[PDB]
Design a protein around this motif. Structure first.
Motif, PDB file in Angstrom:
ATOM      1  N   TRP C 199      -0.483  -2.570 -13.110  1.00 33.24           N
ATOM      2  CA  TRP C 199      -1.769  -1.968 -12.772  1.00 33.24           C
ATOM      3  C   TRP C 199      -1.669  -0.900 -11.692  1.00 33.24           C
ATOM      4  O   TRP C 199      -2.593  -0.090 -11.553  1.00 33.24           O
ATOM      5  N   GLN C 200      -0.572  -0.867 -10.949  1.00 30.41           N
ATOM      6  CA  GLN C 200      -0.436  -0.030  -9.769  1.00 30.41           C
ATOM      7  C   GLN C 200       0.231   1.311 -10.095  1.00 30.41           C
ATOM      8  O   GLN C 200       0.895   1.483 -11.120  1.00 30.41           O
ATOM      9  N   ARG C 201       0.031   2.277  -9.197  1.00 31.00           N
ATOM     10  CA  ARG C 201       0.649   3.585  -9.376  1.00 31.00           C
ATOM     11  C   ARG C 201       2.137   3.552  -9.050  1.00 31.00           C
ATOM     12  O   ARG C 201       2.926   4.238  -9.708  1.00 31.00           O
ATOM     13  N   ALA C 202       2.538   2.769  -8.051  1.00 26.85           N
ATOM     14  CA  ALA C 202       3.929   2.698  -7.623  1.00 26.85           C
ATOM     15  C   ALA C 202       4.077   1.522  -6.670  1.00 26.85           C
ATOM     16  O   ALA C 202       3.093   0.980  -6.169  1.00 26.85           O
ATOM     17  N   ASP C 205       2.283   2.044  -3.491  1.00 30.73           N
ATOM     18  CA  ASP C 205       1.042   2.713  -3.871  1.00 30.73           C
ATOM     19  C   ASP C 205       0.194   1.731  -4.689  1.00 30.73           C
ATOM     20  O   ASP C 205       0.033   1.873  -5.907  1.00 30.73           O
ATOM     21  N   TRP C 206      -0.342   0.723  -4.004  1.00 28.11           N
ATOM     22  CA  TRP C 206      -1.114  -0.351  -4.620  1.00 28.11           C
ATOM     23  C   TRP C 206      -2.551   0.119  -4.852  1.00 28.11           C
ATOM     24  O   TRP C 206      -3.516  -0.328  -4.228  1.00 28.11           O
ATOM     25  N   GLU C 207      -2.665   1.049  -5.790  1.00 25.12           N
ATOM     26  CA  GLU C 207      -3.907   1.644  -6.239  1.00 25.12           C
ATOM     27  C   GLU C 207      -3.795   1.794  -7.746  1.00 25.12           C
ATOM     28  O   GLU C 207      -2.691   2.001  -8.267  1.00 25.12           O
ATOM     29  N   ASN C 209      -3.467   2.828 -11.521  1.00 25.10           N
ATOM     30  CA  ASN C 209      -2.974   4.012 -12.208  1.00 25.10           C
ATOM     31  C   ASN C 209      -3.998   4.473 -13.254  1.00 25.10           C
ATOM     32  O   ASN C 209      -5.105   3.939 -13.362  1.00 25.10           O
ATOM     33  N   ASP C 210      -3.610   5.478 -14.046  1.00 26.00           N
ATOM     34  CA  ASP C 210      -4.510   6.113 -15.007  1.00 26.00           C
ATOM     35  C   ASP C 210      -5.059   5.125 -16.028  1.00 26.00           C
ATOM     36  O   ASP C 210      -6.189   5.286 -16.505  1.00 26.00           O
ATOM     37  N   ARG C 211      -4.285   4.102 -16.372  1.00 28.77           N
ATOM     38  CA  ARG C 211      -4.711   3.141 -17.375  1.00 28.77           C
ATOM     39  C   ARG C 211      -5.768   2.169 -16.870  1.00 28.77           C
ATOM     40  O   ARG C 211      -6.217   1.325 -17.651  1.00 28.77           O
ATOM     41  N   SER C 243       8.914   6.199  -4.064  1.00 32.81           N
ATOM     42  CA  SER C 243       7.596   5.836  -3.563  1.00 32.81           C
ATOM     43  C   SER C 243       7.135   6.848  -2.522  1.00 32.81           C
ATOM     44  O   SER C 243       7.905   7.191  -1.613  1.00 32.81           O
TER      45      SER C 243
END
Lengths: 478, 460, 479, 479
Positions: C199-202, C205-207, C209-211, C243
């Protein structure tokens, strides 16, 4: 195979397939022959392969020191001689008695090496066997006896040469050389020789942009001064940035896996060789000779010739055939052989460099000692190998390399410079690179007297000469 | 080797060869070693592995090849020479890719050759004594197609459609289980029902084990009583140290110059060894296994681990082809599928030829493909990669891309990956599966039968 | 220390320690280093690995340990020290096995200890400050149950029932795919719907992602609208060279004595690095991750790769415990499942604790388990082997054996293999699966619901023998 | 120790140190080891070598340092540690270069430190007890100027104009030859006539040899009778095994932990050894050498091979400083030229400091510089490169670029190469030659006397661009 014989009033045991009498000793036959000295051998004569290679007497008890860096080994000697953990020489070797006589073993055919031990001289042909010469006697006598059995090409006296290499190195141009030509033409030179630096690339033997009017123009100006024109080539050498390397990959000399054979490292790049076993290469190189003659040059300095004989003794047959064609294409032009297999060149060369390049300094100790490379430029390295090849003087013009007269742009001392000048008188091969405008008045006068007078020169021992009435001793440098 | 110059595909090409002459699509060379210099800066090298499971692909020759681990598995992965060299060598044929995407191809026309590739050279070298070569410069597909046309052919109608036991039950097969599956499979448009590895007692003891109590002739008759041909699997030149044959005929083991058994790899949890395919007795015994199988009622034979008859590599292909030629004669018109087998040296003898590593119910085992750097291990991606680079053999043999999966039970493959392997089987026309129908969902049953159906050709 | 003599299990036991004191079921020792000598010839050493994925098993101390390969994966497999050593070292607790099945156990009661096992010796050594030890001699189960009673405890009632996204979709998850599965999953007796890696961007980077365009608080609100708690996965102290955080906060990267980043393994195709859990600012950022997830509506958190907070091993356990203590307070009463985590140093903070390698849809990857000699990679056999040897931690935490498979689609496990895993879920009470209901046949749906809805009594008859409901389940063949 | 955040040169800088306070041009840090993280991808590291002859230059941190050969010469090339290590360490000070041509500078303010440069880190480590540091980020010239202000200074007017016997006659000097040269040299505007190596009986035997039969006071008297000051060369802490001092005082030799003599390099064809500058009796014998030279009439002293008093590197700088302070005391106001010397540890004691390898009558010995990877050997290119990177010390000491050549006899340098060295002599104001006037042509004599007699204004325009008089001189090609 086992044989006993009386040689120099001594009893000598040997192993050979055949034996017959010869002037000054005996002729041996055998792909491999072994000779046992009747004495404790104090020294071995280690004869390097090519011009720059080391020729000297060594202590066979001590081990040879590896030459470094490994990338320079192909341009320093027969690669085999440098990889081996024993003392091997090229063509000829000798053992030295406690009384300064020499037991000499020397091949009469291409492609041989000689191994020296304190108990043995072993001669081995790389390819198919051949003849040998064996002799025991005074040191000078037996080297003279051996040389007499080799080909000779003695073309009068060696010309007097001005050479552009040892002052300007590669930084030469048509304009600078016309200015120097006017200086040089006031002196009793016979040849004005343009050295490395005129060509577009190795393998691209056409004038570069600093020779805009071309090379025949230059030879014509040289001849309008009463001088012969000389030109430098390294005919079988190529680098990876050479257009010939990319246009004819089939001309490059390659190993069993098709990789290019390495020919050394110089001008800051790896060197490669054109295949002198390739008929199309050999006639392209012969055409280089014909082109220089059509341009008006009749003195040619052929350099880096070991490349035609790679990988060593095994390549001498190919080398000889290819040099014979260059000899034919030159007609009666004067061919100076440099970086060249010494014994395999006899009878083709008019002149032959027998030592490492001189340099405006006595010795680079980092190269000679720390890298253990006695083939690098320097007056000491030059002198030492040259001194051990003067016995070739009845076979070829022996070139000791140029003489320095300048003290500007030169680290050599006057006593060191006179050592080189003495050997030029002894061999009669007189060359310099000193531009006259770098010389002081007193030095101009010494150059012209050096060119204009024939000074008698007498050898008194291996390293002692009387030239004029001065005594010149070379023993300290060794 | 004379120095030669020639115009090839509109470019000047220099080469070193003993002979040269015209050939359809290019020229033919003669020589134990030949050398061809590319008229371009080469973008890549076509590396053709030795046997079915070996890598076949375009590589960057600037980067050195990665050693294959474990060492014990090298003999079953490729020509051992190709896996010890630090250069890019191929088996039989190599090519260089030009900046316009054309290829310069050098392929051997006789047994026992390897091809060294660098960005600046193609070197062909016969391990034995010399032979002919084919040299061509042109479009990639044309040039490989032209090379294949000068190689032996054996095109035996269309390939049978096969149900195979290996990729569902592996070695855990038995007479009672296969009778149950046979009745299910017989509802589909198969021609062959083929029993794979697991029926035998040992390698070299090719007699039914105790899970086949009524024997193999019984099973072939039950298969034929359903309208199907019976297929059987052998690994005739392979043996293990605990095989009775290893103990009874130690004179049959392939040995090196010091009498040590040659290593044939590592499988079924134990080290592998080879029967000597240069031993005339071994070949007659292997030919008897083919006759025994025909007499039992099998007329489709999967002959596997055939590289063992050709160790140590290129140098063993002459013995290999002679022994396979004897097996071809003993099989009569039975269908022979060659597996784990020297690819080019099999041509003209095999009816079908596996051209890639085993498929598997998963895309890629990264621990084997990457960390052990072994692209010959089972997995759909390894299978597709080599198969895709050997399709040019389709005029010489039936190209087997290995089986197609339709099940989702007991399978990790995605539906998208599965249809890739299906497409390749349509293209080659070699249709096989191992899915027991009782493992299939109704949708998957229809997909399987629709796939066994003859093609309706589309082209636009 | 002092030489001491003891009667312990009806046997005379010799030992070197600083202090001795009685304790329930055995004795309590003190010393940075203690040495206990078996009063018997020893046939087996209990080798307890460092973290969740590490090998816990009985081994022959006579044979040498096999190097684990590749080297790049050792930081994520075990305490690096146990993997570089020529002798048999375990983490926290060790035991020697007598001919009668009885075990001499030596276990640390504090952080940062290792235990060395030889045929003639148990040697406990604290890496930092000295500490207490539990020593006992008796039957295998009694002796480990008595050790567990002296460790910290945190028993948050009964383990929840979790649907987890990892073991079906892996990283190929998306907000809309999970809303459809949520629909099907909500019909079963689950208590948590947990979103795993993907679920995360990286890393760092615990935010979303596009999905996950509508963000994570939205997904969690739809989950709670179906009667389910929302779960989310983090690797809080892990970071890669790619990262952004690795580049923005180079002062946050765990570094060695020469300032080079400490290697934390190899995963997702790239080398891994750690954030420094001794840096108060990193700990507060990681506690902010917990706070951000609770604010989003997640109250079940799977905190993974936690070994990164305790590198380089035993020495890092004091830092690890203080950083996790802060995340424990930041999480409040939320459920924390510890994964990839120092097993013993996690007790009292984790609500649930993974005790074995990841399960996988297959029995064993032989290339990794045998050729690379890595028993810590995914696989049911590997999962089972370590879990079976850590069940004594049910005194101290919810023991997570990893999910149970019921599907046969997109799975290579056999039904008899799958039932070995299902029994360990009944025994621990920790019940989880990743099976999307749409991948289950009708028969498999019925088995999953009866699995969640019933409590089947399990009893242990021996080290590898259980009785689950009415059936004997025997595990010993898998060693 | 503590993590700290910083606004330095308008950028945010993370660092680790035990203390921090404001300082002119940046900040003062405290700590035995400190770490500073650049706010950029660092493109260059300033690697500052230990002593006069050591390499000072900007290097690519990404590529690995090349071993200097032969190993026997490493003690006379640099701090042995900096040569043995597989990372980029410098002495005292290091700096990281941004994409914008600014430097992040970390420089010690105390003896005995090294700085490690990585693409992502500047790490300062004291070898002994901790100490202060200076940190600054800004234009390259300002931060090196800011750092030099924090170091001691001894600026004694303008540097004297020296004729030196080394770079023409080397060791081959005598009383008779130098009286002859003195007569020609005294026609020129020199202030010092300096007798270099070659007058002494041996290292450690600092008395005239047989070629100086009337002794050294005689010589200084003749030099002063010309209006010149007399200068003399010593290598006071150097000794060889054939030195009588080596045999008469084996207890003065600096020895390692096993009593073997510390090797101090290889020169004059023999191994070099050091006298122990921590031995109070050695320090007073060396101070007495200075007193003896003063009583002989010399008031200009070239103290060479001074690294030997500081072996084995940063660790020896405290001993070195105490011993040099005693020589500074014994010299009074005599002029002390430091050669072969630890550069930063000499400041405040030296009047003049050699900052580069020896010049030589050629541009570069490619065998030594490249194949042996030794950029500390004699050569104009080696001399220029390190000198250029140490001009920022000009407000702490007289910076000696080494002698200028005017002759073309017995010299391989080209006229454009010779002007590069002449320019730095004008920039530093340190004017020396070794050219014997009778080796000079008439036009070269006039350039020498105009060089000595006119002060030419000189302007630095960038790192390697100078305007001296009205010529632009660019050094960027040589690097």
């Amino acid at each position: 195979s086992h044989m006993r014989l009386n040689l120099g009033g001594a009893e000598v045991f040997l192993r050979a397939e055949g034996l017959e009498e010869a002037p000054g000793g005996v002729r041996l036959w055998g792909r491999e022959v072994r000779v046992f000295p009747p004495f404790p051998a104090k020294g071995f004569f280690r004869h390097g392969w090519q011009s720059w290679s080391l020729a000297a007497w060594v202590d066979p008890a001590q081990a040879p020191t590896p030459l470094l860096p490994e990338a320079r080994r192909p341009q320093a000697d027969d690669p085999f001689l440098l990889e081996a953990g024993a003392w091997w020489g090229s063509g000829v070797g000798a053992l030295r008695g406690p009384d300064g006589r020499a037991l000499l073993l020397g091949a009469l055919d291409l492609g041989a090496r000689v191994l020296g031990r304190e108990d043995l001289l072993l001669g081995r042909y790389a390819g198919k066997g051949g003849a040998w010469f064996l002799a025991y006697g005074p040191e000078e006598e037996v080297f003279a006896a051996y040389a007499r059995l080799l080909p000779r090409r003695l073309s009068g006296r060696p010309p007097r040469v001005w050479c552009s290499w040892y002052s300007f190195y590669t930084r030469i141009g048509e304009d600078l050389l016309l200015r120097v030509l006017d200086e040089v033409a006031a002196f009793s030179f016979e040849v004005f020789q343009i050295d490395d630096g005129w060509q577009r690339a190795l393998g691209d033997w056409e004038p570069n942009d600093r020779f805009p009017r071309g090379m025949a123009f230059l030879a014509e100006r040289i001849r309008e001064r009463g001088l012969r024109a000389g030109l430098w080539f390294a005919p079988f050498l190529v680098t990876a940035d050479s257009p010939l390397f990319q246009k004819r990959p089939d001309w490059v000399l390659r190993d069993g896996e098709g990789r290019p054979v390495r020919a050394g490292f110089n001008w800051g790049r790896p060197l490669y060789a054109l295949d002198a076993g390739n008929e199309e290469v050999v006639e392209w190189a012969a055409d280089l000779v014909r082109k220089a003659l059509a341009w008006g040059y009749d003195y040619l300095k052929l350099d880096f010739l070991y490349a035609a004989a790679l990988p060593g003794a095994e390549g001498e047959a190919r080398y000889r055939k290819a040099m014979a064609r260059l000899r034919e294409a030159a007609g009666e032009a004067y061919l100076l052989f440099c970086g060249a297999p010494v014994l395999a060149s006899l009878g083709l060369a008019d002149g032959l460099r027998v030592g490492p390049d001189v340099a405006p300094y006595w010795d680079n100790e980092e190269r000679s000692f720390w890298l253990a490379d006695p083939t690098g430029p320097g007056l000491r390295n030059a002198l030492r190998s040259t001194l051990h090849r003067l016995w070739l003087m009845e076979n070829v013009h022996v070139d000791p390399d140029v003489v320095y007269f300048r003290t500007r742009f030169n680290l050599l001392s006057p006593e060191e410079m006179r050592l080189q000048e003495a050997l030029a008188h002894f061999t009669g091969f007189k060359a310099t690179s000193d531009p006259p405008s770098w010389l002081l008045p007193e030095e101009k006068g010494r150059l012209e007297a050096f060119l204009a007078r024939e000074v008698p020169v007498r050898r008194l021992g291996p390293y002692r000469f009387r030239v004029g009435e001065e005594e010149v001793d070379y023993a300290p440098l060794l």
